[PDB]
């Protein structure tokens, strides 16, 4: 855990992240990242909600999206409220493309 | 036994013994607590038997062999411990320890930020733990209801209000409206179940006790229930569908259709329409009161009896007057009751008789009068038996006079706020949480009984012992609570004056004076332990702590022994004080002159005993001992 | 246990033992600690049958008075765990009914009712005499209960801070088979009536006033065999009328009344063979909230 | 190990005891779990019991100071533990400890006295218990699927030394049941008609059970004097009511004998065997 | 299914449907039972026979919409019921899908 | 325990002394003829001067509800006495015994009205 926490921060340092994701990895790790990237912020958020659709995870990433919608019905910063909206307008368009489960839960009340 | 030889001017009787605090030494039995015979039963049971063992003929063998001790205990629970520290760390907050006399008092604080935190903790911890009782329930419902009579919400404390008395009232009546609104969530949910479309209009009569006119819209459209729908927007409209509606159904009365047509839209256009009694053509008495809550049916009153904007009091006073006498005539609306005894029935009007057999009211209702009215009388408000089935838990009541007093509402008898006071301590005691107890306690100005009170409940719990658990206690006691350890320490000394642990009798029957019995003690038993064994530095702690001159002046014949033992071990130490040394003249004159003084003062006591004669016996021989050596230092070289 | 009817039975202040006393002229002492129990000592040397054994102040120690029929006083002291007599009386005719203490207030004192229509009052210094005053005639026939006033004297409103001396003169009430039910005054060193109430129309049985807890009003319980039960209250010393209240109205004759300690609660002794516990409700008035068999 | 140290192991093992079930005049009811015990604890006791058997019935002087020790009292100990209800390996050990102290005839008559206040086993058919039980039952079950009985014949050698010490003074009378008739019938029909239909992995155990047996018969016999007032009434006026007061013992196993008795027949099989 | 003997009870379930015996009402039920057992990583997982299978069930809950209406009572919770059996057919889909990818990756 | 009938030294000597005690004793150890005479002449002291025979010291003359015995005792003996029925010989020794009580009851009562005078 300790490597994992210096390869974080030195790679957020000097920008290989896309170099790291394309890499075999480990379920543990991968869980590890989870556990780090949920506490750390919502930018911090929208970076795993993009890793999760790098690694094609779509039902998670939803997940994080009404976590992250739920969140910004406080906060009112324009740049906030601009990049909100345009994942508003993104979750919208995925989320009922993907398989029925999620369309199951958009059949049901909210 | 038997009693039939009953003649008269007879013998005499007896009685079960008393117990601290409604403990009971009983021989008998109070529910189901004593035991039959025979140690083997077909349904798989054991029980007792100890009588007959003597005897292989019976003569009515009772005679008690075991008495048993019991404690009145309401429920079972191990998990009201929050339950009861919550509130109580409330007050912690909300009240102030007056600190006047060595014994402090503990007095409330007006902050009505309590009834709040309160109240929305209430509902936090009712959403945390899935795990709470119908009677948390209630007493949540006493707590909004407050809070609605003279508590600010939020939803007024985001908007600025207005001082018109017309505005409070609309807004007193508004937050009312979200209060059902909270209400009848699991009312809606719980009938929800119950209809459908076929129970289609009980649903709209439902939705009509709630004003739900929303939700009741939504619903009729995902059933495709246009007409419904335009009529659910009339409930509401102008006074001028009531007139529509009057006249119509003269109409309709003048045309005998309600023959033919069911009672149940009948009794939603009564709804509509305001009317809460119809008198038809037959004197048909279609009434509109089912199923509901004397709650639904004033709010049914705001919405549509009056202007539905209107204040909360004159629909009151109609409301109370519709389930009251009107002119000596049948009641017509709901008459209020506890949440308990609406379980066992309710009313919807007529009949005072059957009114005046029991039914007793709900004390929300007594609030209201009070919000109302100062006029009022009050003896009757805080009693939680009365609201709920269960005789304890005092909190209701307690905490909600607390609130009264924050709230200026000090208006009744000290004689039953102290009475609750020492009913819910000693529901405290029974738990076995006396240092809160005290926090309750202290909310008297009375500081000599009050000072009694916690002197047995500090007897009861007085642990000389050591335990981190009495750690923090003490912890708690003194350094929250505020009480001198001056009361703690008069505990541990009358606990060890049964008890006998020295360590503590000496300390503090030295810090009360108790010169006499510091003698009898200390001299009969640590002087000569100590003279035996050369351990002398306690002793020599002790007779230094006697020895304190604002002691002395209270003492008397600390000089005849105590000083004088003292005066001994000066000398012994200063002794080794010249061993340690090698030349000292100008101390050895003064061992010389001590020891001059004390070979002469040696023998004047001691010997009260055989242990006396040990002591002064041991006393004389080491004085001449010392005086032997001091000679033989003190010679020329 | 005993091997009889029992007399009455009285806790340490602990609340870890047992002192009891039977007709079997003997008294069981019994340590409970687990689901067990021990028979620490039992104690013998009574006569008659046993009627009461009395606690003192614990502000001294463990200390025991009984009374005993057959002229009897006898008043035990605990010592190196053994508990001994340190006193007797003698010299009343008539069963002495009932022995009750004193707080530590007033000291080590009790009161004692004789079936003789007299009373005595014994003051004990704690280590030295016994300080007895009779009180002939005190009823006009035997003196049925008695009760003290509970600790100190009047002044118990909000007073000055703590730590104060009230003065210590004492007050207390007993009702007896003269149909008559008394209060008496410490007065002129004397003890004299306070007051005189005939109402029971027959023959006292039992007294209780409330050891009352932060109450100005002064409640006493008091039953004879009429059926009728009548709680005498005076809400304070200003208070000179006292005033009965039916607790209820039942047909036998009611032989014992007893709060315990926070007076919240008594319980009642009647032909019933049920001993029923009452309480004033929040709101007041007399709930027969319990029942038990002895 | 001394008798400080097993005594205070007793003491502490029979407080848990009773604490684990009821107070005396009990044998089960509804209590917290008893004490583990592991198979070393029970090598040691029967070990030590053994050794203490052993010393008890060499030595008298350990005898007496044993049953004298006041701040010990075995007696009542053994009376809780017996009241207990256990794997009875160590019920009988009591048994058999007792056996050994009875040898004082004076602490015989006060074994005597104090069983039948007891009633380990079944006395008086009055209910209010559970009766009917004792050895019986724990032969019927375990004593058959070992194949070996021995605390049926120590019991057997526990009445043997009780009547041979000690002898009746009392039975009952309308307090207790008198007579031993109960336990009479009981070892007759339980063990002396069932001794031989016992399944044995050795043969050794046969031989050692009927001596058990007859030699307890054969103090009976030495024992009991015939009188001839033994021939004089059966139903005797408690205040005017004839009550039934059986014959004595030895009246009955005599005219038992006297007529046909399967007595006889196992007689002739012993016999036959030898 | 209470031992949890994965390989003989989806056998011997697999041969009594095959055998096709008893009302469809409680082949929904059996089916539903199924679930966990065709979650779980098994290669005797036919599923060709566990779609004939589900075609069987398509054709009995025709037949069982011809023959009545699922649901006669309105409530809250009937339309629950309805869309819970299609989310369970659903769910069959799926984890068929699923299946049939393990054992595709077994074939290897 | 040895199967002892009292002897008669002992009887006088520690009646003399008490004789309740013996009562409860007669009642634990089934001596119920007995106590039927000590309570036949329990009775008959009340009624004349034999407290002396009883280790008891008080003047009698007379029966009161204000004089002192084990009415309890006497009344459990009436107990076991309604129990131990199955003979007439029981019931006749009964009868007698009612006879006394009875006896005893009025002169009880004229007494007791004697006292109500007071």
């Given at each position: ?110 | ?48 038997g100890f009588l007959p063992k003597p005897t292989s003929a019976k003569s009515?063998t009772?005679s008690?062999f ?572 | 246990?005993?091997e ?35 028979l620490?000592?039992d ?252 | ?9 007793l003491?502490?093992?029979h407080?848990?005891?009773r604490?684990?079930?009821p107070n005396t005049d009990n044998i ?25 058997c052993?010393?008890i019935?060499?030595?008298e002087?350990?005898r007496l100071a044993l049953c004298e020790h006041a701040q010990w009292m075995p007696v009542v100990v053994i009376l809780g533990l017996l009241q207990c ?6 019920k009988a050990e009591l048994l058999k400890t007792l056996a050994a102290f009875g040898k004082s005839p004076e602490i015989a008559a006060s074994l005597w006295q104090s069983l039948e206040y007891t009633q380990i086993l079944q006395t008086v058919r009055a209910?209010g218990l559970?009766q009917?039980v004792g050895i ?15 605390l049926?014949?120590a019991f057997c050698q526990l009445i043997s030394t009780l009547v041979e010490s000690s002898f009746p003074t009392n039975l009952g009378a309308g307090l207790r049941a008198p007579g031993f008739e109960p336990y009479l019938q009981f070892l ?28 307890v018969?054969?103090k009976l016999?030495?024992d009991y004097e ?12 408690l ?6 007061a059986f014959?004595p013992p030895g ?24 | ?108 | 325990s040895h199967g002892v009938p009292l002897p008669?030294?002992l009887?006088?000597?520690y ?6 005690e013996l009562?409860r004793l007669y009642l634990k150890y089934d001596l119920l003829?007995e ?84």
């Amino acid at each position: 855990e300790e490597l994992l926490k210096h390869m974080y921060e030195m790679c957020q340092e000097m920008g290989l992240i896309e170099e790291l994701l394309k890499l075999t990895f480990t379920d543990f790790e991968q869980g590890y990242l989870h556990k780090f990237l949920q506490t750390t912020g919502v930018q911090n958020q929208e970076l795993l909600l993009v890793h999760h659709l790098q690694r094609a995870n779509y039902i998670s990433a939803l997940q994080l999206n009404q976590s992250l919608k739920t969140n910004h019905l406080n906060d009112c910063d324009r740049r906030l409220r601009e990049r909100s909206g345009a994942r508003n307008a993104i979750l919208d368009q995925y989320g009922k493309i993907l398989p029925r489960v999620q369309r199951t839960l958009a059949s049901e009340r909210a | 036994t038997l009693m039939i030889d009953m003649g008269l001017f007879m013998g005499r009787s007896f009685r079960v013994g008393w117990g601290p605090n409604w403990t009971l030494v009983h021989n008998g039995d109070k529910l189901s607590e004593r035991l039959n015979a025979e140690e083997d039963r077909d349904m798989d049971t054991i029980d007792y038997g100890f009588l007959p063992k003597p005897t292989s003929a019976k003569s009515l063998t009772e005679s008690p062999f075991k008495v048993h001790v019991e404690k009145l205990s309401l429920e079972q629970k191990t998990k009201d411990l929050q339950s009861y520290l919550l509130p109580l760390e409330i007050e912690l907050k909300n009240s102030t320890v007056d600190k006047s006399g060595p014994c402090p008092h503990f007095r409330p604080n007006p902050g009505v930020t309590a009834i709040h935190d309160y109240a929305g903790w209430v509902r936090n911890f009712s959403s945390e733990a899935a795990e709470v009782e119908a009677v948390v329930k209630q007493w949540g419902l006493t707590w909004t209801l407050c809070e609605s009579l003279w508590g600010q919400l939020k939803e007024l404390e985001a908007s600025l209000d207005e001082p018109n008395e017309y505005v409070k009232n609309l807004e007193r009546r508004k937050a009312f409206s979200h209060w059902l609104a909270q209400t009848a969530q699991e009312r809606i949910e719980e009938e929800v179940s119950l209809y459908g479309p076929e129970r289609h209009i009980e649903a709209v009569f439902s939705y009509l006790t709630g004003g739900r006119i929303s939700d009741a819209c939504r619903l009729a459209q995902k059933s495709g229930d246009h007409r419904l729908s335009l009529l659910l927007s009339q409930m509401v409209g102008s006074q001028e569908v009531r007139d529509l509606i009057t006249l119509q159904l003269v109409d309709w009365n003048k045309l005998q259709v309600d023959h033919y047509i069911q009672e149940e839209r009948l009794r939603v256009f009564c709804l509509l329409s305001g009317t809460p009694v119809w008198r038809s053509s037959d004197n048909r008495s279609i009434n509109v009161c089912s199923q509901l809550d004397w709650k639904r049916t004033l709010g049914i009153h705001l919405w549509y009896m009056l202007p539905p904007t209107a204040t909360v009091a004159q629909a009151l006073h109609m409301y109370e007057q519709a389930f009251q006498e009107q002119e000596g005539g049948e009641p017509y609306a709901c008459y209020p009751l506890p949440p308990y005894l609406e379980d066992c029935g309710f009313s919807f009007g007529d009949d005072p008789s059957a009114k005046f057999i029991s039914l007793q009211r709900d004390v929300c209702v007594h609030l209201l009068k009070l919000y109302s009215e100062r006029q009022y009388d009050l003896c009757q408000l805080l009693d939680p038996s009365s609201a709920t089935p269960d005789p304890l838990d005092y909190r209701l009541s307690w905490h909600m006079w607390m609130v009264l007093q924050a709230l200026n509402y000090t208006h009744l008898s000290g004689h039953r706020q102290g009475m609750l006071h020492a009913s819910y301590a000693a529901q405290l005691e029974n738990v076995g949480l006396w240092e809160w107890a005290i926090f309750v306690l202290l909310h008297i100005q009375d500081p000599h009984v009050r000072e009694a009170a916690v002197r047995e409940l500090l007897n009861r719990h007085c642990v000389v012992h050591d335990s981190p658990e009495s750690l923090a206690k003490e912890n708690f006691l003194i350094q929250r609570l505020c009480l001198p350890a001056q009361w703690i320490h008069k505990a541990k000394a009358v606990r060890s004056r049964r008890d006998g642990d020295k360590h503590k009798e000496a300390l503090y029957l030295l810090k009360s004076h108790q010169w006499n019995q510091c003698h009898k003690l200390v001299t009969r038993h640590l002087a000569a332990d100590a003279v035996i064994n050369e351990n002398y530095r306690y002793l020599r702690g002790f007779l230094g702590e006697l020895a304190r001159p604002e002691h002395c002046k209270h003492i008397q014949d600390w000089e005849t022994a105590g000083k004088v033992y003292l005066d001994y071990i000066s000398v012994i130490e200063m002794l080794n004080q010249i061993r340690q040394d090698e030349c000292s003249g100008g101390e050895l004159e003064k061992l010389h002159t001590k020891v001059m003084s004390l070979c002469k003062w040696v023998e004047l006591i001691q010997c009260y005993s055989a242990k006396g004669r040990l002591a002064q016996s041991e006393m004389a021989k080491r004085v001449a001992n010392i005086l032997r050596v001091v000679l033989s230092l003190q010679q020329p070289p | 246990s005993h091997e009889d009817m029992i007399h009455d039975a009285q806790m340490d202040y602990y609340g870890i033992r047992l002192a009891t006393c039977s007709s079997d002229r003997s008294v069981k002492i019994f340590d409970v600690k687990n689901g067990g129990q021990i028979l620490i000592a039992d104690l013998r040397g009574h006569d008659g049958p046993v009627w009461q054994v009395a606690w003192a102040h614990p502000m001294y120690g463990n200390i025991l008075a009984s009374c005993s029929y057959d002229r009897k006083v006898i008043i035990w002291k605990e010592e190196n765990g053994t508990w001994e007599k340190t006193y007797e009386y003698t010299g009343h005719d008539s069963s002495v009914n009932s022995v009750c203490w004193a707080p530590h207030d007033f000291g080590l004192v009790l009161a004692c009712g004789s079936s003789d229509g007299a009373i005595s009052i014994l003051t004990f210094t704690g280590d030295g005499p016994w300080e007895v005053k009779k009180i002939s005639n005190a009823h006009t026939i035997g003196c049925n209960a008695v009760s003290w006033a509970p600790s100190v004297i009047p002044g118990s409103l909000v007073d000055q801070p703590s730590s104060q001396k009230p003065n210590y003169i004492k007050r207390f009430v007993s009702g007896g088979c003269d149909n008559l039910v008394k209060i008496w005054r410490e007065e002129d060193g004397q003890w004299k009536e306070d007051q005189k109430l005939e109402a029971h129309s027959d023959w006292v049985r039992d007294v209780a006033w409330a050891p009352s807890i932060g109450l100005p009003t002064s409640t006493i319980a008091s039953c004879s065999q009429d059926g009728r039960v009548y709680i005498w209250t005076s809400d304070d010393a200003a208070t000179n009328c006292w005033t009965p209240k039916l607790l209820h109205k039942f047909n036998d004759v009611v032989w014992h009344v007893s709060w315990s300690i926070t007076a919240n609660i008594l319980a009642v002794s009647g032909g019933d063979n049920k001993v029923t516990l009452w309480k004033e409700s929040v709101d007041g008035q007399w709930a027969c909230i319990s029942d038990v068999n002895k | 190990v001394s008798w400080d140290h097993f005594f205070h192991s007793l003491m502490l093992y029979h407080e848990h005891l009773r604490r684990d079930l009821p107070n005396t005049d009990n044998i089960h009811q509804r209590h917290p779990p008893l004490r583990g015990i592991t198979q070393r604890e029970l090598d040691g006791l029967i070990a030590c019991l053994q050794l203490t058997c052993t010393i008890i019935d060499w030595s008298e002087s350990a005898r007496l100071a044993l049953c004298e020790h006041a701040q010990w009292m075995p007696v009542v100990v053994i009376l809780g533990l017996l009241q207990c209800s256990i794997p009875p390996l160590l019920k009988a050990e009591l048994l058999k400890t007792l056996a050994a102290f009875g040898k004082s005839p004076e602490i015989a008559a006060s074994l005597w006295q104090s069983l039948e206040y007891t009633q380990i086993l079944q006395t008086v058919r009055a209910t209010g218990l559970r009766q009917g039980v004792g050895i019986e039952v724990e032969l019927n079950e375990i004593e058959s699927r070992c194949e070996e009985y021995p605390l049926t014949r120590a019991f057997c050698q526990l009445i043997s030394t009780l009547v041979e010490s000690s002898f009746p003074t009392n039975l009952g009378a309308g307090l207790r049941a008198p007579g031993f008739e109960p336990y009479l019938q009981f070892l007759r029909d339980t063990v002396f008609l069932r001794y031989r239909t016992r399944a044995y992995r050795r043969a050794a155990e046969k031989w050692e059970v009927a001596e058990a047996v007859l030699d307890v018969f054969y103090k009976l016999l030495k024992d009991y004097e015939p009188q001839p007032e033994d021939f004089v009434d059966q139903y005797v006026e408690l205040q005017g009511e004839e009550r039934v007061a059986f014959k004595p013992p030895g009246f009955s196993l005599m005219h038992h004998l006297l007529n046909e008795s399967p007595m006889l027949e196992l007689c002739l099989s012993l016999m036959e065997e030898g | 299914y209470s031992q949890e003997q994965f390989s003989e009870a989806a056998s011997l379930l697999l041969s009594l449907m095959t055998a096709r015996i008893a009302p469809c009402s409680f082949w929904l039920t059996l089916l539903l039972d199924a679930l966990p057992l065709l979650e779980q990583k098994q290669v005797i997982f036919s599923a060709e026979q566990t779609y004939e299978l589900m075609r069987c069930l398509e054709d009995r809950m025709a037949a069982k919409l011809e023959s009545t209406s699922p649901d006669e009572i309105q409530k809250q919770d009937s339309s629950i019921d309805n869309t819970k059996v299609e989310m369970l057919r659903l769910a069959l889909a799926r984890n068929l899908a699923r299946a049939i990818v393990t054992e595709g990756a077994l074939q290897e | 325990s040895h199967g002892v009938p009292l002897p008669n030294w002992l009887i006088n000597r520690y009646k003399a002394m008490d004789a309740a005690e013996l009562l409860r004793l007669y009642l634990k150890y089934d001596l119920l003829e007995e106590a039927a005479e000590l309570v036949l002449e329990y009775v008959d002291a009340l009624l004349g001067k034999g407290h002396q025979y009883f280790g008891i010291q008080a003047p009698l003359s007379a029966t009161s509800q204000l004089v002192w015995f084990p009415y309890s005792a006497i009344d459990h003996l009436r107990l076991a006495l309604g129990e131990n029925e199955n003979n007439q010989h029981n019931q006749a020794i009964l009868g007698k015994l009612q006879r006394k009580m009875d006896e005893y009851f009025q002169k009880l009562k004229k007494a007791t009205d004697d006292y109500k005078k007071i």
